[PDB]
Amino acid sequence: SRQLLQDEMKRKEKLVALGHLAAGVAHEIRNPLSSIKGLAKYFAERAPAGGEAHQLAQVMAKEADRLNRVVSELLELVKPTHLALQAVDLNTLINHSLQLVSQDANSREIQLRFTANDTLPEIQADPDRLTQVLLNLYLNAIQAIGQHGVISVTASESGAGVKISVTDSGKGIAADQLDAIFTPYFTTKAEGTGLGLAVVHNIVEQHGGTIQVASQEGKGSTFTLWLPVNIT
Amino acid sequence: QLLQDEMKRKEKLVALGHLAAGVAHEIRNPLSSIKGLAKYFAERAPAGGEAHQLAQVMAKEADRLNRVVSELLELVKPTHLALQAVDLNTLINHSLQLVSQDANSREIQLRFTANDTLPEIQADPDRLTQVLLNLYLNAIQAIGQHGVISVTASESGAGVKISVTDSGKGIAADQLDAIFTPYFTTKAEGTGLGLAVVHNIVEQHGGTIQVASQEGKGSTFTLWLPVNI
Ligand SMILES: Nc1ncnc2c1ncn2[C@@H]1O[C@H](COP(=O)(O)OP(=O)(O)O)[C@@H](O)[C@H]1O
Ligand SMILES: Nc1ncnc2c1ncn2[C@@H]1O[C@H](COP(=O)(O)OP(=O)(O)O)[C@@H](O)[C@H]1O
Ligand SMILES: [Mg+2]
Ligand SMILES: [Mg+2]
């Protein structure tokens, strides 16, 4: 028995270690990309405007920024699961996230809607990762509405856990794309990282919850989150 | 359930491979164009100036990013096969036995007939067992209760064919290749990595996997593996 546990512990250790080394390699990819992004901006600025050199240098800079954001999200995904659990009231966390996105919503003329239920029970979760998830969903919704929209967030008690649903009024998603939407590296945006919903899924998986989506193209979309009241 | 954990770890390694190949593609298409732009700016700029040196620096940086992405890919590259002689009858039986209790409780019938004349192939038993377990679990999920699971093994050419047929719930034909793509799944819970592991192991061995499915009727998955790699 002593050796068998030593064994299972060793296989688990090998997977987490591979994750740690992968995070390091990703951090080292960020360094030449950041160098490339800076040097491509210099060349774009110094190059004669309007020409092919200027266009190519600016496109390459934009691509290097997109690549740094892709690599940061990849690091978030490859990193071993590390959750700082805490008892959190969801109303306060949701309000804080909404206040975090308020300026960008008002700039684009998008309404933030959320009603709080003080009856709502506290959940065992990592508040920073839940923020990173809510913000990713909010950003997706904002990009999709583009202007003149509304975001409705609600929280309710489902069995044991809670369901936070974020509904937008944007372009929606076709049923054909309704499955590749969570697939890594898939995006319909030229300045998009197709890893935001991958990160959302990973974080909600580490929390033992579920992410589901219901969308009608043009009408809008709704992302529903189930998070357990007790992590165990 | 320590088996379930080992399965999950294999799924995570396959996922890391996919993520790495994706970042590599996304990083590599621009790289060549950046290196050319660097070369044009450097030839245009006077020798020794700041634009010249910085252009060489940008080129070297693109080459270094290629080296680092190659490193990530090599790190997630799967270990070579532990090639050993395997009697597939014994393996299929052990695989079904690892599923015996869950199939029994969920009212699932396990049917296999062994051919004594079936040759023993050079393969990795643990990985083949992983492909079999993945196919079986997917099949049980396809039908919670009142189903039958049929496995057949046969010689074919210079190889062997194993077919897993289930009553299940069926998969439409409009989504056939996409079933093998990693992170692809038709259930709310669950990863989309099982058949990704299956395909990775089969292609590692040197064989092929094919699917047949009638909606509402059931699904058949066929594996061809070589006798000597
Ligand atoms: N609220 C939404 N409304 C419409 N489409 C959405 C929404 N959220 C996600 N999507 C779709 O999912 C794809 C993947 O999103 P994600 O993985 O977060 O990356 P990105 O936001 O960079 O595209 C988007 O390109 C888009 O097509
Ligand atoms: N034999 C089958 N019968 C019915 N549906 C299947 C079968 N095999 C795979 N599927 C569907 O395709 C998805 C892809 O399988 P897989 O990648 O293993 O995902 P999972 O880990 O959720 O089982 C499954 O989740 C299931 O929804
Ligand atoms: Mg996004
Ligand atoms: Mg599966």
Swiss-Prot record, chain B:
Give every Histidine kinase domain span. 22-229
Phosphohistidine occurs at H25
Origin: domain of life: Bacteria
Identification of the protein by name? Sensor histidine kinase ZraS
User: Which conditions up-regulate this protein?
Assistant: Induced in response to high concentrations of Zn(2+) or Pb(2+). Expression of the zraSR operon is positively autoregulated by ZraR. Expression also requires the RNA polymerase sigma-54 factor.
Q: What function does the entry list?
A: Part of the Zra signaling pathway, an envelope stress response (ESR) system composed of the periplasmic accessory protein ZraP, the histidine kinase ZraS and the transcriptional regulator ZraR. The ZraPSR system contributes to antibiotic resistance and is important for membrane integrity in the presence of membrane-targeting biocides. ZraS is a member of the two-component regulatory system ZraS/ZraR. Functions as a membrane-associated sensor kinase that phosphorylates ZraR in response to high concentrations of Zn(2+) or Pb(2+) in the medium.
What's the source species for this entry? Escherichia coli (strain K12)
Q: Where in the cell is it found?
A: Cell inner membrane
Q: Which gene encodes it?
A: zraS
| Organismal lineage | Bacteria, Pseudomonadati, Pseudomonadota, Gammaproteobacteria, Enterobacterales
The full protein's residues present here are: 230 to 458 of 465
Present the record's domain note. Answer: Contains one high-affinity Zn(2+) binding site per monomer.
Gene inactivation effect: Deletion of the gene does not affect the minimum inhibitory concentration (MIC) of E.coli for zinc or copper.
Q: How is it modified after translation?
A: Autophosphorylated.
- Membrane-side (Cytoplasmic) residue stretches: 1-229
